[PDB]
Design a protein around this ligand. Structure first.
Ligand SMILES: [Mg+2]
Ligand SMILES: [Mg+2]
Ligand SMILES: [Mg+2]
Ligand SMILES: [Mg+2]
Ligand SMILES: [Mg+2]
Ligand SMILES: [Mg+2]
Ligand SMILES: [Mg+2]
Ligand SMILES: [Mg+2]
Ligand SMILES: [Mg+2]
Ligand SMILES: [Mg+2]
Ligand SMILES: [Mg+2]
Ligand SMILES: [Mg+2]
Ligand SMILES: [Mg+2]
Ligand SMILES: [Mg+2]
Ligand SMILES: [Mg+2]
Ligand SMILES: [Mg+2]
Ligand SMILES: [Mg+2]
Ligand SMILES: [Mg+2]
Ligand SMILES: [Mg+2]
Ligand SMILES: [Mg+2]
Ligand SMILES: [Mg+2]
Ligand SMILES: [Mg+2]
Ligand SMILES: [Mg+2]
Ligand SMILES: [Mg+2]
Ligand SMILES: [Mg+2]
Ligand SMILES: [Mg+2]
Ligand SMILES: [Mg+2]
Ligand SMILES: [Mg+2]
Ligand SMILES: [Mg+2]
Ligand SMILES: [Mg+2]
Ligand SMILES: [Mg+2]
Ligand SMILES: [Mg+2]
Ligand SMILES: [Mg+2]
Ligand SMILES: [Mg+2]
Ligand SMILES: [Mg+2]
Ligand SMILES: [Mg+2]
Ligand SMILES: [Mg+2]
Ligand SMILES: [Mg+2]
Ligand SMILES: [Mg+2]
Ligand SMILES: [Mg+2]
Ligand SMILES: [Mg+2]
Ligand SMILES: [Mg+2]
Ligand SMILES: [Mg+2]
Ligand SMILES: [Mg+2]
Ligand SMILES: [Mg+2]
Ligand SMILES: [Mg+2]
Ligand SMILES: [Mg+2]
Ligand SMILES: [Mg+2]
Ligand SMILES: [Mg+2]
Ligand SMILES: [Mg+2]
Ligand SMILES: [Mg+2]
Ligand SMILES: [Mg+2]
Ligand SMILES: [Mg+2]
Ligand SMILES: [Mg+2]
Ligand SMILES: [Mg+2]
Ligand SMILES: [Mg+2]
Ligand SMILES: [Mg+2]
Ligand SMILES: [Mg+2]
Ligand SMILES: [Mg+2]
Ligand SMILES: [Mg+2]
Ligand SMILES: [Mg+2]
Ligand SMILES: [Mg+2]
Ligand SMILES: [Mg+2]
Ligand SMILES: [Mg+2]
Ligand SMILES: [Mg+2]
Ligand SMILES: [Mg+2]
Ligand SMILES: [Mg+2]
Ligand SMILES: [Mg+2]
Ligand SMILES: [Mg+2]
Ligand SMILES: [Mg+2]
Ligand SMILES: [Mg+2]
Ligand SMILES: [Mg+2]
Ligand SMILES: [Mg+2]
Ligand SMILES: [Mg+2]
Ligand SMILES: [Mg+2]
Ligand SMILES: [Mg+2]
Ligand SMILES: [Mg+2]
Ligand SMILES: [Mg+2]
Ligand SMILES: [Mg+2]
Ligand SMILES: [Mg+2]
Ligand SMILES: [Mg+2]
Ligand SMILES: [Mg+2]
Ligand SMILES: [Mg+2]
Ligand SMILES: [Mg+2]
Ligand SMILES: [Mg+2]
Ligand SMILES: [Mg+2]
Ligand SMILES: [Mg+2]
Ligand SMILES: [Mg+2]
Ligand SMILES: [Mg+2]
Ligand SMILES: [Mg+2]
Ligand SMILES: [Mg+2]
Ligand SMILES: [Mg+2]
Ligand SMILES: [Mg+2]
Ligand SMILES: [Mg+2]
Ligand SMILES: [Mg+2]
Ligand SMILES: [Mg+2]
Ligand SMILES: [Mg+2]
Ligand SMILES: [Mg+2]
Ligand SMILES: [Mg+2]
Ligand SMILES: [Mg+2]
Ligand SMILES: [Mg+2]
Ligand SMILES: [Mg+2]
Ligand SMILES: [Mg+2]
Ligand SMILES: [Mg+2]
Ligand SMILES: [Zn+2]
Lengths: 84, 62, 208, 99, 100
RNA sequence: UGGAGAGUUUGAUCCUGGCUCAGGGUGAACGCUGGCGGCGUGCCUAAGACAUGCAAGUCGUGCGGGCCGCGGGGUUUUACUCCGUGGUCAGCGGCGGACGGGUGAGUAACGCGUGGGUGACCUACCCGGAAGAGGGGGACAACCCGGGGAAACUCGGGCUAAUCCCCCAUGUGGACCCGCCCCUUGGGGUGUGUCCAAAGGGCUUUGCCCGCUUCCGGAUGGGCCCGCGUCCCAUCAGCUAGUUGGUGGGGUAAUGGCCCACCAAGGCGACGACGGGUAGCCGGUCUGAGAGGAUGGCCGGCCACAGGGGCACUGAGACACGGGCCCCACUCCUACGGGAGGCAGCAGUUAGGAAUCUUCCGCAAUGGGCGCAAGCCUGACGGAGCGACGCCGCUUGGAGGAAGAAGCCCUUCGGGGUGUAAACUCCUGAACCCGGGACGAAACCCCCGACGAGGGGACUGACGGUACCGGGGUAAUAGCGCCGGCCAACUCCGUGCCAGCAGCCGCGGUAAUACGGAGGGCGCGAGCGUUACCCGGAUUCACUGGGCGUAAAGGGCGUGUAGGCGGCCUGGGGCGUCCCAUGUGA
């Protein structure tokens, strides 16, 4: 099924994952369906994360699927707080 | 093929390597021989342009 | 790596003082007030009308030999400068001065550029409070260049800073002599510093 | 010197021998109706044609026939029989045909 | 949208089928001179009504047959066997270029 | 926001014109030499052949057995079945193995690029909506027994489990025939007839969860078709029998001459058919002022192939690298009595070659599959390893230091040069020594709240004690090319058309700035050269941007086919052309 995961960028010993929506049968650094933010597991930038919640949950309404590690960020990004 | 420099050690069944580049004075020969390769030893007692002539750096004083 | 060896000979190959030495290339001569002629056996011999090429070659070596920087790193700049818009020629020296080892020579921390390199290299120089042992480092507006604590002494630093009293700094610099700190205020236009070098001839030499 | 997933093949045979046998039936059985509906016997034929319809649509519970397949079969089946019986025959049991 | 073209008919010697000859003017990518082209299609005509000279139209359609993926749209002006002339000459003259 | 020219035809001139150089580029190679780090990149050749290892498995929340345990049911001799938990190894069933990895052979074609079509279609797992999950039978492994073999193993006889198989029921719904309605290429709907479903397993069970079943949507991934674009030779000019159209069938998810019958005789080509040759295409890449030219290697998209061919099975999807059958060739085991294998997966071996690496570490991270979840596999991947192959950063030091030693060069023997260079005196002091030491990790999971939200807690690092931090701390690799002109850099000697240099023009005949060494100089620097190839200069295929009286070039002359081109006014159309708007051009 279509998933939401991390895609290594940047360089060696210097990750800069791109968070994106694409088919699970694609290569992790392949052609994705839609880019929706990034993340720096090194914390070496004020913008070490960013999400387009309006566009993110949409794929969830159509039935997406985040990784166990992509969840973490997604949840710890303020996209899961159901609210009322 | 041309053999550059002064004096060589090439007999009949000698191995060798081709370079490319004609002579001119010598019609019908458009290839030079790389020195200090296979059976082509560099020019002995060469002190100037050693890059070609496949001569290695000699010892100065002792 | 960088150049090493006879330098007063260059001082006089171009036929101009360039103060690559500390006191000497600045004392009575770069070995030239003695012998103001070119090195080599053919020194005291008349010269042949230098060709338009040899002129641009000479006027180039001059400039590069001044900052004592390899032909590598060197042309890289001109291209980066040339890449830009405006004048490039002026922009060029802009990128030349921005070097760390350069700022140090100007800010009197050292007398010679080659002495300034040893400083930056060994780690006796600072930048906004950082250990920057890289002479290639390019500096911008407001950058603070001081000495590190492990070094804020050394009988060689006090001498250099001391000599800097009774002397001024560029219209694009400012030194806190008594504190060991300096600042890069702005990029020095062609005016801000005059030199035996006609850039325009260096621009031509690169459009082979 | 291999993998145990060689099963898949070792299985895939059964599924083969399974829906192969299931299919040889449909063919010989789809014939009955054809032959009959060709020769008057509307009654006895229009019970083989309901059956045929079975085995066909029944088959769609596995990886034998699927998609518009069973549909294309009948489409040509319970349309071919109606044309045959149309010549003489005269209908007898719509048991399968919304005439 | 389904591609739509305007061409003339030169053949109907196929049971249910006609051959339409199309043209298109466009500048040369390197010399910019406005030039013409040509492409014969196999037009589907079930009710074989159209004949030669029929300056008609055609529409992109589902595969009728191999080589035949175009149905006929409408007439644009029948009775033009004049265009079918210069086309007939061309193929006519192709027996004068033979390397024999 | 972008453009340089020079050398060589003559005694000299102008022109034409070719050859040559300076420039940038490369998956490179070769010579001489070679210290550090970082980030890239590394079989272009034999898509030749490959030992060994590894590269896809997973679920006991589908079943029965295996022994092993294991706390331990209960009694007519080595424990017992009873239990549960397991631990499981194989067997049954489920999911994946069609993704991910490699290669460029083939293909000049709807393969690709770009824009569209499908009222001619499929799509498992995922999401949403509606309805269901009623009963009744059966098989094969496992296992016991039997045969053959050296093996591969194989067959044979008889039991048994289920989410395995079968039948009936139920039909929310779906499927097809006909009529009808709307739309209108088989789209939606209607009526009537007939056909069609299911699966249980685990529980902090009596309520949830993990699944099952049919349908209508969502999403994603596709298939098929179409317009335009896609190299060289016309010294390949004619090609075609399923060939072109038809009818009707077979076939598929479905169109199609895809396949098969029969009907007709068509279909294609100088707008280059057919044929031979070369080639995987694009994003991009290199060069260029530009337009162009060249290129498709790493990374990304598509295609194709998986020893050479053919084929079908299973399946949602393959005609399937690590799945199967057959033929071929090749190779290997063998007690020869017979069987085995497919590196263009990761490394490595071998051959070929001018030439291209470790038979390394780790699943810590990211991604993938299986699972309720721990957890499991993962030569994808993260890293480390080798190669100045590339770009980048870094070092072999810094100040002072003589009217300026020695040595070696020239010399008119007065002197000039190497040269602040060294020495020498101070200064710092990369490497190394000691301690410290990571960011990369947070979730999944656990408790609270209902496993929702939220909060809290905990786990895990391959790289490796590595980057980096402190301090201690030593002056510590320099090589290569050129110095006739183009083109930057000159003297002595040796040599005497010899030995030799050479991109071009040309150097050497006893005074050679052109050979060979030396001194000195110019140019670069862990590089410097060489060879080869692409663009540039070449405006030298000239679209931008050239020529044909004598420099290469007007057909020997007409007639004329196709083709290109076309006079003054006015109207319709608005193809070309032009503006705006919008989509696409990741
Ligand atoms: Mg895919
Ligand atoms: Mg979470
Ligand atoms: Mg500018
Ligand atoms: Mg230039
Ligand atoms: Mg079912
Ligand atoms: Mg099937
Ligand atoms: Mg010239
Ligand atoms: Mg002449
Ligand atoms: Mg002459
Ligand atoms: Mg010319
Ligand atoms: Mg070159
Ligand atoms: Mg290549
Ligand atoms: Mg090989
Ligand atoms: Mg071979
Ligand atoms: Mg377990
Ligand atoms: Mg595969
Ligand atoms: Mg792949
Ligand atoms: Mg490889
Ligand atoms: Mg690779
Ligand atoms: Mg061909
Ligand atoms: Mg062709
Ligand atoms: Mg036995
Ligand atoms: Mg039996
Ligand atoms: Mg039973
Ligand atoms: Mg039933
Ligand atoms: Mg309908
Ligand atoms: Mg049932
Ligand atoms: Mg159980
Ligand atoms: Mg495909
Ligand atoms: Mg048909
Ligand atoms: Mg199929
Ligand atoms: Mg057909
Ligand atoms: Mg048909
Ligand atoms: Mg036929
Ligand atoms: Mg002709
Ligand atoms: Mg054409
Ligand atoms: Mg042609
Ligand atoms: Mg061919
Ligand atoms: Mg090829
Ligand atoms: Mg291109
Ligand atoms: Mg580019
Ligand atoms: Mg440009
Ligand atoms: Mg271009
Ligand atoms: Mg190409
Ligand atoms: Mg490759
Ligand atoms: Mg690739
Ligand atoms: Mg092979
Ligand atoms: Mg698929
Ligand atoms: Mg496979
Ligand atoms: Mg296969
Ligand atoms: Mg395939
Ligand atoms: Mg394999
Ligand atoms: Mg093997
Ligand atoms: Mg390998
Ligand atoms: Mg290897
Ligand atoms: Mg060899
Ligand atoms: Mg590697
Ligand atoms: Mg892992
Ligand atoms: Mg994982
Ligand atoms: Mg799980
Ligand atoms: Mg394994
Ligand atoms: Mg491993
Ligand atoms: Mg790797
Ligand atoms: Mg290195
Ligand atoms: Mg080398
Ligand atoms: Mg002196
Ligand atoms: Mg001296
Ligand atoms: Mg010194
Ligand atoms: Mg000390
Ligand atoms: Mg410690
Ligand atoms: Mg874990
Ligand atoms: Mg928490
Ligand atoms: Mg926490
Ligand atoms: Mg340490
Ligand atoms: Mg230290
Ligand atoms: Mg020293
Ligand atoms: Mg040179
Ligand atoms: Mg030069
Ligand atoms: Mg000169
Ligand atoms: Mg001579
Ligand atoms: Mg002579
Ligand atoms: Mg020489
Ligand atoms: Mg002499
Ligand atoms: Mg002479
Ligand atoms: Mg020379
Ligand atoms: Mg010489
Ligand atoms: Mg010298
Ligand atoms: Mg010299
Ligand atoms: Mg090189
Ligand atoms: Mg240029
Ligand atoms: Mg022109
Ligand atoms: Mg001309
Ligand atoms: Mg004329
Ligand atoms: Mg003449
Ligand atoms: Mg003439
Ligand atoms: Mg004439
Ligand atoms: Mg004429
Ligand atoms: Mg004639
Ligand atoms: Mg004529
Ligand atoms: Mg005419
Ligand atoms: Mg006209
Ligand atoms: Mg007109
Ligand atoms: Mg008009
Ligand atoms: Mg637009
Ligand atoms: Zn000086």
């Amino acid at each position: 099924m279509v998933k939401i995961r991390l895609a290594r960028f940047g360089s060696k010993h210097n990750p800069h994952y791109r968070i994106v929506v694409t088919d699970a049968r694609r290569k992790r650094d392949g052609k994705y369906i839609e880019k929706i933010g990034y993340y720096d597991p090194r914390k070496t930038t004020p913008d070490w994360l960013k999400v387009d919640v309006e566009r993110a949950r949409y794929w969830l309404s159509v039935g997406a699927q985040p990784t166990d590690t992509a969840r973490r960020l997604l949840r710890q990004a303020g996209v899961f707080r159901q609210e009322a | 093929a041309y053999i550059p420099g002064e004096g060589h050690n090439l007999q009949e069944h000698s191995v060798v390597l081709i370079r490319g580049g004609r002579v001119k004075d010598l019609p019908g020969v458009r290839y030079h021989i790389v020195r200090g390769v296979y059976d082509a030893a560099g020019v002995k007692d060469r002190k100037k342009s050693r890059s070609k002539y496949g001569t290695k750096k000699p010892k100065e004083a002792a | 790596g960088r150049y090493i060896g006879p330098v007063c000979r260059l001082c006089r190959r171009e036929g101009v003082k360039l103060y690559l030495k500390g006191e000497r290339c600045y004392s009575p001569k770069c070995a030239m007030e003695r012998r103001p002629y070119p090195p080599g056996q053919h020194g005291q011999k008349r010269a042949r009308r230098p060709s338009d090429y040899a002129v641009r070659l000479r006027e180039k070596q001059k400039l590069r030999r001044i900052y004592g920087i390899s032909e590598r790193q060197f042309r890289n700049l001109f291209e980066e400068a040339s890449k830009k818009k405006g004048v490039t020629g002026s922009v060029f020296l802009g990128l030349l001065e921005s070097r760390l080892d350069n700022v140090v020579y100007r800010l009197g921390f050292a007398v010679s550029r080659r002495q300034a390199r040893q400083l930056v290299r060994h780690g006796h120089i600072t930048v906004n409070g950082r250990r920057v042992d890289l002479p290639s480092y390019r500096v911008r507006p407001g950058d603070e260049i001081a000495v590190a604590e492990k070094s804020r002494n050394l009988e060689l630093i006090r001498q250099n800073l001391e000599a800097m009293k009774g002397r001024k700094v560029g219209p694009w610099l400012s030194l806190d002599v008594e504190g060991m700190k300096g600042k890069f205020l702005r990029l020095p236009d062609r005016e801000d510093l005059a030199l035996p070098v006609n850039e325009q001839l260096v621009i031509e030499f690169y459009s082979r | 010197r291999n993998l145990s997933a060689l099963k898949r093949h070792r299985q895939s045979l059964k599924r083969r021998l399974r829906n192969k046998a299931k299919k040889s039936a449909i063919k010989t059985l789809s014939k009955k109706a054809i032959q009959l509906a060709q020769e008057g016997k509307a009654e006895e034929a229009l019970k083989i044609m309901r059956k045929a319809e079975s085995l066909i649509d029944k088959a769609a519970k596995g990886s034998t026939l699927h998609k518009n397949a069973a549909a294309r079969r009948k489409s040509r089946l319970m349309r071919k029989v109606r044309q045959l019986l149309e010549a003489a025959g005269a209908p007898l049991i719509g048991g399968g045909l919304s005439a | 949208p389904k591609k739509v073209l305007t061409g003339v008919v030169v053949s109907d010697k196929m049971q249910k089928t006609v051959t339409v000859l199309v043209e298109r003017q466009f500048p040369h990518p390197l010399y910019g001179k406005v030039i013409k082209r040509s492409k014969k299609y196999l037009a589907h005509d079930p009710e074989e009504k159209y004949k030669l000279g029929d300056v008609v139209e055609i529409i992109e359609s589902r595969p009728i047959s191999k080589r035949k993926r175009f149905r006929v749209l409408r007439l644009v002006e029948s009775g033009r066997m004049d265009l079918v002339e210069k086309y007939l000459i061309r193929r006519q003259n192709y027996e004068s270029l033979s390397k024999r």
